Amino acid sequence: ASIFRCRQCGQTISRRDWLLPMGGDHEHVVFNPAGMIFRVWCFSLAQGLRLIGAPSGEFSWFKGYDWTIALCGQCGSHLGWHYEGGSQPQTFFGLIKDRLAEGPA
Amino acid sequence: SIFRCRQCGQTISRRDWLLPMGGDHEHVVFNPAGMIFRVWCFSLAQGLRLIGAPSGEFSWFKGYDWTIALCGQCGSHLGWHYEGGSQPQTFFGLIKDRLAEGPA
Amino acid sequence: SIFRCRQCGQTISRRDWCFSLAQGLRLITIALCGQCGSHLGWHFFGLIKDRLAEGPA
Ligand SMILES: Cc1cc(N)ccc1C(=O)N[C@H]1CCC(=O)NC1=O
Ligand SMILES: Cc1cc(N)ccc1C(=O)N[C@H]1CCC(=O)NC1=O
Ligand SMILES: [Zn+2]
Ligand SMILES: [Zn+2]
Ligand SMILES: [Zn+2]
């Protein structure tokens, strides 16, 4: 019973039970076109976020998925991205590990 | 999909250059210091600096000698170059979490 | 060459021992890693190879 909370405001976001091994690992170190590097943990589900914009396929780290920016729905901190439009799974979250705090349910 | 050094962005390898050694490009191995590594095998890499002389001692890959591979830019230890074997003669075993994957 | 739990590094088995002997498991048989409780296989010990790591003795 471990949960991940927004490090800025404490809202519960996801659960350790929901870690998802995308391509063999739940941890992906990635860089965007601006050269910013993120350590992303993949989760099946989340709550308490606000997904902003329409999904985009441009520069997706995960082939066959479109992404949307995920903010903490409470404080607006950028916590990662939601991925959709794929298969097995259809949808999942890539959340920035350093912006989360893990603790007891 | 390009692999860069996670510490500095040096260009290192490509997803196209992954090599399934023994049926898998990923090997999970431990050294005699008890460190566990998820090693990805690549046919080719660039931007590294190979340090020292090859050694067969404790090689995870039978028939190959290894040389330490640093990031040629920042000096971070990214893995090993393997040589002296067959099919292939040489390849790179890089530590997955010391790389960052992203756009070409 | 020694087989260890990939998740926590518990020693499980070796090259010399589908295994005939293992250590460090808890049989529930479903074989859990005794240390971290990862499902590593069943008891003949059958172990998920992808759930192991290999190194020197
Ligand atoms: C595409 C992009 C352009 C910018 N000017 C700044 C940032 C980004 C960015 O992080 N995009 C991310 C979105 C999620 C993903 O999968 N891949 C990406 O590169
Ligand atoms: C051989 C060795 C001795 C130490 N004192 C510390 C670390 C290491 C080490 O990582 N060696 C690696 C080199 C690459 C290989 O294939 N197998 C290994 O165990
Ligand atoms: Zn928040
Ligand atoms: Zn570097
Ligand atoms: Zn374990």
What does each C-alpha distance from C22 to A1, C5, C27, C32 come to in angstroms? 30, 12, 11, 12
CATH of the domain at A34: 2.170.150.20
C11, containing H or E segment: strand C11-14
- Tokens, residue B22: 């023994």
One DSSP character per residue, B12-70 reads EEEGGGB--BTTBSEEEEE-TT--EEEEEEES---SEEEEEEEE-TT-SSTT-EEEEEE
- Tell me how the structure was determined: X-ray
Rg (CA), chain C: 10
Alpha-carbon distance of C24 to C3, in angstroms, equals 11
Give the sheet arrangement for strand B11-14, strand by strand.
A49-56, A66-72, A78-84, A92-96, A37-43, A27-31, B99-102, B2-5, B11-14
- DSSP β-bridge partners for residue B3: B13, B101
One DSSP character per residue, C39-53 reads EEEE--BEE-GGGEE
- Tokens, residue B4: 């860069």
Using a 6 Å CB cutoff, which residues line ligand 2? B 31-33, 57-60, 66, 80
For this experimental structure, what is the resolution in angstroms? 1.8
Nearest CA in chain B to A36: B9
Alpha-carbon distance of C53 to C2, in angstroms, equals 8
- DSSP β-bridge partners for residue A6: A100
Nearest ligand 2 atom to alpha carbon B60: 16
Alpha-carbon distance of A57 to A34, in angstroms, equals 16
CB B50 within 8 A of CB B68: yes
Domain count of the fold of chain B: 1
- Which residues of B contribute to the annotated binding site for Ca(2+)? 24, 26
- Which residues of B contribute to the annotated binding site? 5, 8, 24, 26, 71, 74
Nearest CA in chain B to C52: B28
- Tokens, residue B67: 């040389």
Amino acid letter for position B56: G
Residue range of the domain that includes C51: 2-55
